[PDB]
Amino acid sequence: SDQLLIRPLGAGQEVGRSCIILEFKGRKIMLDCGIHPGLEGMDALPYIDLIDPAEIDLLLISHFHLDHCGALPWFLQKTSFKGRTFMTHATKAIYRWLLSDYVKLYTETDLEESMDKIETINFHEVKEVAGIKFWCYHAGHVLGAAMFMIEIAGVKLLYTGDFSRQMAAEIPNIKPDILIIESTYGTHIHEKREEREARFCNTVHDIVNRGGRGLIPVFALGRAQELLLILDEYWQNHPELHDIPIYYAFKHISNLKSMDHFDDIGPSVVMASPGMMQSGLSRELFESWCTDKRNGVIIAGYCVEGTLAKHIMSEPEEITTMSGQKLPLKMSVDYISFSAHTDYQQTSEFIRALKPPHVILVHGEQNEMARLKAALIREYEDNDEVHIEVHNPRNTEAVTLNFR
Numbered sequence: 001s002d003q004l005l006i007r008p009l010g011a012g013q014e015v016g017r018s019c020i021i022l023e024f025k026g027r028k029i030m031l032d033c034g035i036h037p038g039l040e041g042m043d044a045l046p047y048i049d050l051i052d053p054a055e056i057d058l059l060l061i062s063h064f065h066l067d068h069c070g071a072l073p074w075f076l077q078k079t080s081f082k083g084r085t086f087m088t089h090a091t092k093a094i095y096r097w098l099l100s101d102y103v104k105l106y107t108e109t110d111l112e113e114s115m116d117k118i119e120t121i122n123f124h125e126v127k128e129v130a131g132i133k134f135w136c137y138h139a140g141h142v143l144g145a146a147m148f149m150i151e152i153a154g155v156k157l158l159y160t161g162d163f164s165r166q167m168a169a170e171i172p173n174i175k176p177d178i179l180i181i182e183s184t185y186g187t188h189i190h191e192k193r194e195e196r197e198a199r200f201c202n203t204v205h206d207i208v209n210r211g212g213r214g215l216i217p218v219f220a221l222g223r224a225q226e227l228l229l230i231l232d233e234y235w236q237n238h239p240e241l242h243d244i245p246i247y248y249a250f251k252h253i254s255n256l257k258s259m260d261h262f263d264d265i266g267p268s269v270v271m272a273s274p275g276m277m278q279s280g281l282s283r284e285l286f287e288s289w290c291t292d293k294r295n296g297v298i299i300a301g302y303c304v305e306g307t308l309a310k311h312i313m314s315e316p317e318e319i320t321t322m323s324g325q326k327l328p329l330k331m332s333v334d335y336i337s338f339s340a341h342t343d344y345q346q347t348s349e350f351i352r353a354l355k356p357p358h359v360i361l362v363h364g365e366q367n368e369m370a371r372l373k374a375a376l377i378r379e380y381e382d383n384d385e386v387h388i389e390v391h392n393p394r395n396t397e398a399v400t401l402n403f404r
C-alpha cells in the first residue's frame with residue numbers, strides 16, 4: 001500500500017489564500033497559491049514555510065481570483081520553487097491584468113517575470129509532469145475557471161477549485177478516488193434566481209426613489225456584467241427612472257472612470273470595484289455616502305472575514321475611514337448573493353454523482369464547513385453500500401490515505 005497526503009496551507013477551515021499540498025509516491029503538488037483578501041502583507045500568505053518550494057513538482061491554478069493566485073508572483077520569483085506551473089489560457093491572461101491592478105509581497109516587475117514561468121493548458125487535454133497526469137474540466141464560476149483531475153499510479157483526485165452549477169460546471173464521468181471541494185456556502189440553499197434579481201432591482205429602486213445614492217461593489221467580472229444587464233432591463237421597464245443615472249466603474253448605463261471623472265449628484269446607482277471594499281472607488285464612495293440614510297449599499301458577492309464589506313453586514317454603529325476618521329453608518333445595507341458558488345443541493349448532487357470514498361472540504365468558514373461536513377456525513381451515514389469519509393482539515397493539518 002502507498003500513502004497519500006493532503007495538507008491545506010491556506011483555505012483550511014477558512015475562505016482565502018487557497019493553497020493545498022498533495023504528496024504521493026514521491027511526487028509533490030501544490031493546488032492554487034492565493035492570498036487572504038482580509039489580511040495584510042506576509043500574513044495574508046499561505047503557510048508555505050511548512051514546505052520546501054524546491055520539492056514541489058507541479059503547481060496547478062484553478063482560476064484568476066486573488067484568493068487562488070494572488071501569491072503566485074511571490075512564490076515563483078522569491079522562493080526555491082523550480083517546478084512547473086499551469087493555468088488555462090484565459091486564467092493566465094486575466095492573471096497579469098488583475099494581479100497588476102492589485103499592485104496598488106512583490107512588484108510589477110516580478111509579475112511580468114513570472115508570466116514566462118507559467119504554462120497554459122486547454123480544457124479536456126491531458127498533460128504529464130513527473131509521472132503526474134492531469135487535465136481539467138469547466139468549473140463555471142468565472143471565465144477560464146477549471147477543476148483539475150489528477151492521476152498518479154492509478155489513483156485519481158478531483159480538485160474543484162471554485163465552481164458553480166447554475167456556464168455550469170461539468171460533472172466528470174471519470175470517478176475520482178478523492179475529491180477536494182469548496183465549502184463556501186455550507187448548507188445554505190440559494191434563493192430562486194428570479195426572486196434574487198427581483199429583490200436586487202426592488203432594493204436599488206427603493207434607494208433612488210427616496211433620493212438616495214446606491215452603491216453596488218463588484219469585482220473584475222464575477223457577476224458585474226450580469227447585474228448591469230438586469231438593471232438596464234429593469235430601467236427600460238420603468239420610465240419613471242430614466243432620469244436616474246447608473247454608472248459602472250447598454251441604454252441606461254454609462255461608464256465611469258474615476259471619482260474625479262463623475263459628478264456625484266442627486267439619486268444614482270454606482271457599480272464599482274473592489275467588491276469587498278478594502279480600497280479603491282467602492283470604498284471612497286462608501287465613505288462619502290455612509291452618513292446619509294437615503295443612501296444604500298448592496299453587497300452582491302461573498303465577503304471574506306477581515307474585509308470592510310463583511311464588517312458592514314454586522315451593522316456597526318460607526319465605520320473606520322481609511323484616514324482613521326469615525327463616521328456613523330446611516331446608509332442602508334443589503335446582501336443579495338451573486339458570487340457564483342454551488343449551494344448545498346448542488347454540492348450534494350455533485351458528490352452523489354461521483355461518490356468519492358474520500359471528500360476533503362476546503363474554502364469555507366470554519367462553522368459553515370462543519371455543518372457541510374455533518375450534513376454530508378448524515379447523507380451516507382444511512383446506506384451501508386456507499387462509504388464516504390468527509391474531512392475538514394485546518395491549515396497545516398494533514399489528511400492521510402492508504403491505497404492498494
Ligand SMILES: [Zn+2]
Pocket residue numbers: 063065141162
Ligand atoms: Zn473564486
Ligand SMILES: [Zn+2]
Pocket residue numbers: 016065067068162363
Ligand atoms: Zn475563492
